[PDB]
Scaffold this motif. Sequence first.
Motif, PDB file in Angstrom:
ATOM      1  N   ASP A 156       0.869  -1.294  -0.208  1.00 26.37           N
ATOM      2  CA  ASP A 156      -0.194  -0.059  -0.037  1.00 26.37           C
ATOM      3  C   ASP A 156       0.863   1.132   0.046  1.00 26.37           C
ATOM      4  OD1 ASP A 156      -1.659   1.973   0.576  1.00 26.37           O
ATOM      5  OD2 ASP A 156      -2.307   1.276   2.543  1.00 26.37           O
ATOM      6  N   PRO A 157       1.302   1.634  -1.360  1.00 22.81           N
ATOM      7  CA  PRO A 157       2.046   2.922  -1.241  1.00 22.81           C
ATOM      8  C   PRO A 157       1.455   4.270  -0.514  1.00 22.81           C
ATOM      9  CG  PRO A 157       0.761   2.566  -3.417  1.00 22.81           C
ATOM     10  CD  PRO A 157       0.480   1.410  -2.356  1.00 22.81           C
ATOM     11  N   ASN A 158       0.241   4.131  -0.221  1.00 26.29           N
ATOM     12  CA  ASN A 158      -0.435   5.245   0.669  1.00 26.29           C
ATOM     13  C   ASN A 158      -0.480   4.650   1.992  1.00 26.29           C
ATOM     14  OD1 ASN A 158      -0.894   7.428  -1.313  1.00 26.29           O
ATOM     15  ND2 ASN A 158      -2.143   5.875  -2.289  1.00 26.29           N
ATOM     16  N   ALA A 159       0.080   3.897   2.404  1.00 21.15           N
ATOM     17  CA  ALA A 159       0.162   3.235   3.953  1.00 21.15           C
ATOM     18  C   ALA A 159       0.366   4.467   4.800  1.00 21.15           C
ATOM     19  CB  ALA A 159       0.832   2.092   4.097  1.00 21.15           C
ATOM     20  N   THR A 160       0.376   4.112   6.216  1.00 26.59           N
ATOM     21  CA  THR A 160       0.574   5.241   7.222  1.00 26.59           C
ATOM     22  C   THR A 160       1.706   4.523   8.029  1.00 26.59           C
ATOM     23  OG1 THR A 160      -1.134   6.396   7.361  1.00 26.59           O
ATOM     24  CG2 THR A 160       0.172   6.417   9.124  1.00 26.59           C
ATOM     25  N   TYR A 188       7.358   2.891  -6.733  1.00 28.31           N
ATOM     26  CA  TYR A 188       7.058   2.915  -5.217  1.00 28.31           C
ATOM     27  C   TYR A 188       7.182   4.513  -5.096  1.00 28.31           C
ATOM     28  CZ  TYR A 188       6.504   2.939  -0.265  1.00 28.31           C
ATOM     29  OH  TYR A 188       5.910   3.129   0.880  1.00 28.31           O
ATOM     30  N   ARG A 189       5.850   4.860  -5.394  1.00 27.89           N
ATOM     31  CA  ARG A 189       5.364   6.487  -5.014  1.00 27.89           C
ATOM     32  C   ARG A 189       4.586   6.558  -3.915  1.00 27.89           C
ATOM     33  NH1 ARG A 189       9.177   8.718  -8.209  1.00 27.89           N
ATOM     34  NH2 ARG A 189       8.928   8.033 -10.662  1.00 27.89           N
ATOM     35  N   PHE A 190       5.398   6.735  -2.839  1.00 30.07           N
ATOM     36  CA  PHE A 190       4.847   6.956  -1.511  1.00 30.07           C
ATOM     37  C   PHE A 190       3.702   8.194  -1.427  1.00 30.07           C
ATOM     38  CE2 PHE A 190       4.597   8.429   2.935  1.00 30.07           C
ATOM     39  CZ  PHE A 190       3.880   7.178   3.412  1.00 30.07           C
ATOM     40  N   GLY A 191       2.493   8.010  -1.057  1.00 31.43           N
ATOM     41  CA  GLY A 191       1.650   8.707  -0.651  1.00 31.43           C
ATOM     42  C   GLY A 191       0.705   8.876   0.472  1.00 31.43           C
ATOM     43  N   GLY A 192       1.555   8.373   1.541  1.00 35.51           N
ATOM     44  CA  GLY A 192       0.692   7.976   2.883  1.00 35.51           C
ATOM     45  C   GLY A 192       1.132   8.978   3.578  1.00 35.51           C
ATOM     46  N   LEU A 193       1.101   8.656   5.003  1.00 31.93           N
ATOM     47  CA  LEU A 193       1.733   9.435   5.810  1.00 31.93           C
ATOM     48  C   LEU A 193       2.957   8.744   6.847  1.00 31.93           C
ATOM     49  CD1 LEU A 193       1.610  11.867   7.646  1.00 31.93           C
ATOM     50  CD2 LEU A 193      -0.142  10.979   9.215  1.00 31.93           C
ATOM     51  N   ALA A 194       3.906   9.738   6.799  1.00 26.61           N
ATOM     52  CA  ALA A 194       5.239   9.066   7.334  1.00 26.61           C
ATOM     53  C   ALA A 194       5.455   9.830   8.661  1.00 26.61           C
ATOM     54  CB  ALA A 194       6.424   9.232   6.433  1.00 26.61           C
ATOM     55  N   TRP A 195       5.434   9.453   9.694  1.00 21.13           N
ATOM     56  CA  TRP A 195       5.663  10.153  11.046  1.00 21.13           C
ATOM     57  C   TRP A 195       6.937   9.782  11.820  1.00 21.13           C
ATOM     58  CZ3 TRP A 195       0.741  11.418  14.341  1.00 21.13           C
ATOM     59  CH2 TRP A 195       1.161  12.560  15.326  1.00 21.13           C
ATOM     60  N   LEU A 196       7.729  10.447  11.951  1.00 19.47           N
ATOM     61  CA  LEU A 196       8.937  10.110  12.711  1.00 19.47           C
ATOM     62  C   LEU A 196       9.236  10.640  14.219  1.00 19.47           C
ATOM     63  CD1 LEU A 196      11.815   8.545  12.741  1.00 19.47           C
ATOM     64  CD2 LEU A 196      12.635  10.813  11.785  1.00 19.47           C
ATOM     65  N   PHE A 197       9.316   9.947  14.959  1.00 15.94           N
ATOM     66  CA  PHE A 197       9.572  10.372  16.341  1.00 15.94           C
ATOM     67  C   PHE A 197      11.050   9.836  16.749  1.00 15.94           C
ATOM     68  CE2 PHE A 197       5.444  11.495  18.321  1.00 15.94           C
ATOM     69  CZ  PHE A 197       4.637  11.029  17.477  1.00 15.94           C
ATOM     70  N   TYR A 219       7.473  17.827   1.867  1.00 13.40           N
ATOM     71  CA  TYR A 219       6.200  17.064   2.091  1.00 13.40           C
ATOM     72  C   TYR A 219       5.299  17.358   3.153  1.00 13.40           C
ATOM     73  CZ  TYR A 219       8.758  14.734  -1.966  1.00 13.40           C
ATOM     74  OH  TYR A 219       9.425  14.493  -2.961  1.00 13.40           O
ATOM     75  N   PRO A 220       4.978  18.638   3.343  1.00 16.03           N
ATOM     76  CA  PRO A 220       4.339  19.112   4.739  1.00 16.03           C
ATOM     77  C   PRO A 220       2.881  18.071   4.993  1.00 16.03           C
ATOM     78  CG  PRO A 220       4.512  20.874   3.215  1.00 16.03           C
ATOM     79  CD  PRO A 220       4.649  19.626   2.460  1.00 16.03           C
ATOM     80  N   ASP A 221       2.218  17.506   3.766  1.00 17.71           N
ATOM     81  CA  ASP A 221       1.065  16.618   3.882  1.00 17.71           C
ATOM     82  C   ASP A 221       1.585  15.235   4.022  1.00 17.71           C
ATOM     83  OD1 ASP A 221       0.000  18.846   1.423  1.00 17.71           O
ATOM     84  OD2 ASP A 221      -0.592  19.015   3.472  1.00 17.71           O
ATOM     85  N   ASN A 222       2.876  14.709   3.953  1.00 12.89           N
ATOM     86  CA  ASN A 222       2.882  13.270   4.034  1.00 12.89           C
ATOM     87  C   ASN A 222       4.116  13.024   5.049  1.00 12.89           C
ATOM     88  OD1 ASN A 222       2.554  14.406   1.015  1.00 12.89           O
ATOM     89  ND2 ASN A 222       1.561  12.353   1.317  1.00 12.89           N
ATOM     90  N   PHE A 223       4.679  14.076   5.673  1.00 10.45           N
ATOM     91  CA  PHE A 223       5.700  13.689   6.710  1.00 10.45           C
ATOM     92  C   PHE A 223       5.763  14.580   7.902  1.00 10.45           C
ATOM     93  CE2 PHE A 223      10.093  14.218   8.431  1.00 10.45           C
ATOM     94  CZ  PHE A 223      10.318  12.981   8.742  1.00 10.45           C
ATOM     95  N   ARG A 224       5.488  14.005   9.014  1.00  5.07           N
ATOM     96  CA  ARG A 224       5.594  14.586  10.364  1.00  5.07           C
ATOM     97  C   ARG A 224       6.716  14.170  10.943  1.00  5.07           C
ATOM     98  NH1 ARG A 224      -0.388  14.910  13.235  1.00  5.07           N
ATOM     99  NH2 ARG A 224       0.828  16.213  14.627  1.00  5.07           N
ATOM    100  N   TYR A 225       7.177  15.037  11.994  1.00  2.00           N
ATOM    101  CA  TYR A 225       8.822  14.802  12.520  1.00  2.00           C
ATOM    102  C   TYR A 225       8.594  15.510  13.820  1.00  2.00           C
ATOM    103  CZ  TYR A 225      13.663  15.283  12.940  1.00  2.00           C
ATOM    104  OH  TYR A 225      14.911  15.312  13.295  1.00  2.00           O
TER     105      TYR A 225
END
Lengths: 309, 97
Positions: A156-160, A188-197, A219-225
């Motif tokens: 799922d290229p749009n997985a979280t 592999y065109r990622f379109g989901g949500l990547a959140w790194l802690f 990618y403000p809409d796909n990556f949280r940090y």
Amino acid sequence: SKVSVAPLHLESAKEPPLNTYKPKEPFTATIVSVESLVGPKAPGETCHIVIDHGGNVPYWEGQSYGVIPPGENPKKPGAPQNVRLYSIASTRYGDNFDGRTGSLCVRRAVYYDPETGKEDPSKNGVCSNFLCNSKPGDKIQLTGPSGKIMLLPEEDPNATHIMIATGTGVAPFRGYLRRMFMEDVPNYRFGGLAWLFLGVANSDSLLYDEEFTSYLKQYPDNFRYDKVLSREQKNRSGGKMYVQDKIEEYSDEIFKLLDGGAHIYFCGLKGMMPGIQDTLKKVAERRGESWDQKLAQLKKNKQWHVEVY
Amino acid sequence: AVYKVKLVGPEGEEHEFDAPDDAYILDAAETAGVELPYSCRAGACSTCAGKIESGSVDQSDGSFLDDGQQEEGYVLTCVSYPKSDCVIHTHKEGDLY
Ligand SMILES: Cc1cc2nc3c(=O)[nH]c(=O)nc-3n(C[C@H](O)[C@H](O)[C@H](O)COP(=O)(O)OP(=O)(O)OC[C@H]3O[C@@H](n4cnc5c(N)ncnc54)[C@H](O)[C@@H]3O)c2cc1C
Ligand code: FES
């Protein structure tokens, strides 16, 4: 724009390579570079090591490399050193978009008299110091690649993907993120949500911040940090700030994602899990759920991924 | 040579499959559709811990278990080569300390 990577035939493999090189007959690789990742205030050194395997020891992100430091096993005379495992910190193309190199994020293990605070070089980590002491041209006994637990689920290229890391635990995520955002990988065109802690000791201990902060811009809409500097920040009750504390600040948000099918990963020294689990337990209960049951379900759904050591 | 490896789950569940003497048991088991516990997959931990009932293996590629643990029959299935037919009990990580 994304960086061009080659060769693309590295996408053709259906199954990941495993144990291409065993301890008895390791591959002889060459050091391309070594650099400290931290500032003067960091508790200790953590270095970035680029290794040239020439395309002979390819791998998939999330896997690790084995390194056999020179000398003999101090516990078994006549025997060579035990292999030390290291989470590869690079994508399969490597920092050179070559498909020729791989990288390790190595923390220097040193010994200090609990009292005189003086370091006893005779009692520090053999392989980690060996690695961070390396120079361009040094040869290194490489084994592997190994591991499957941290393979990135791409169906799922749009997985979280929620990534919780401490210290060198950030290694595989650096691999995921370059693949999701920095590299031009057609299949592999990622379109989901990547959140790194990421939790570290202080800002001088931050690892690859410029790289991750970079994704927050592109990618403000796909990556949280979210970062946690334990020796500089404090939690709600005045104690040192840890990753579980930051996870707690987004408890409801994080449980939604998990409830929506999000993958969660943990990586770094194993002493990071107890606190993490306790916090998860308390968050599930403040929501009326049984943590044991939810964990069992998360594992059942293959959403729980741990690589601690 | 290819041997037959028979595994016993923590509840009596059994699985018998082919195991080349040059292939790790963990891989031989997965080939036959058998899910086993693992972590590093490189003989550095105990997650894949198992315990011999009969037979023998070569797990020298591993370094987590000490001589004593290996004397008792404990083997790291991710780095174990079957040296003959064996009967191994899985999920023994809980016995190691
Ligand atoms: C799957 C996996 C992934 C890993 N990924 C990473 C990674 O990405 N980055 C990373 O840095 N590490 C990682 N590790 C850990 C790594 O493999 C090593 O365990 C680590 O680097 C320490 O190895 P060493 O050879 O330096 O030290 P060792 O010599 O093995 O020593 C272990 C500890 O003993 C201390 N010591 C030695 N002799 C004495 C003595 N006489 N008295 C008191 N103390 C003593 C050393 O200083 C050290 O702290 C991973 C491990 C696994 C299993
Ligand atoms: S999975 Fe760690 S030693 Fe086998």
